[PDB]
């Protein structure tokens, strides 16, 4: 194993530790493409977790500066200020693929904003957030997973990213609430007569289920529209991206099955993931 192999292996570790679902699917990609996905994912994870390093923006500022050095001098040697292993891997990717750097900056700006989080007034603000933390990631991944990127390719990837984010939110209501985060909009909470603190204390009720299902319907419709447009992606990536998406859709059924519980994180069994993969490959 070379030094760069070690860098990418560390990126893989970070990705698998954070999301088994995502890892399961994307580990099926060809070698060059899988490694690029690991590096991009890891950078994004590092940005997402940055604030809790010392409890301020110091590390996040360093990450941003590392990315800016890569963008402006992709072929110069850099002494990276943040996580060297991850930044060397990203630089290696950048030398071979067109990285949407403004997408990383959008993600970083979103993370900056999150330290003075206030609840979203409307669903438009919530969807803006889903773009910020997840749509941006889809945009960065676009050139890795497609051969000739058009505005359509980016559009579809962006939509998938945002659907996944919404599904994460739908899975993590209780956990987010404990961490003083509520992502459902105030508009929608008021309309459905829902109070998350109340529900966390007293269990689900029909108002909450209706509110939850309202958003779940959005995720599922977005999912189907992405499925209809799967051919913008390279032939190798299509089954993989379809797998990722299906595994996440199944997360919604896992929640319904646990009766929308706010007190544990539901999940799709590894064996169930293998089943979805079989069902999908059968038609590939
Ligand atoms: N965990 C979690 S929530 C994920 C948030 O960041 C993303 C977003 C999308 C994604 O897969 C995509 C593949 C192609 C295009 C767009 C997305 C992987 C990670
Ligand atoms: Mg969440």
Swiss-Prot record:
- What are the binding positions for Mg(2+) 2 in this chain? 168, 172
Q: Which keywords describe this protein according to UniProt?
A: Carotenoid biosynthesis, Magnesium, Metal-binding, Transferase, Virulence
UniProt EC number: 2.5.1.96
Task: Name the positions where Mg(2+) 1 binds.
Answer: 48, 52
| Molecular functions (GO terms) | geranylgeranyl diphosphate synthase activity; metal ion binding; squalene synthase [NAD(P)H] activity
CDD domains, per database record: Trans_IPPS_HH
Q: Which reaction does it catalyse?
A: 2 (2E,6E)-farnesyl diphosphate = 15-cis-4,4'-diapophytoene + 2 diphosphate
Q: What does this protein do?
A: Involved in the biosynthesis of the yellow-orange carotenoid staphyloxanthin, which plays a role in the virulence via its protective function against oxidative stress. Catalyzes the head-to-head condensation of two molecules of farnesyl diphosphate (FPP) into the colorless C(30) carotenoid 4,4'-diapophytoene (dehydrosqualene).
Q: What is this protein called?
A: 4,4'-diapophytoene synthase
Q: What's the source species for this entry?
A: Staphylococcus aureus
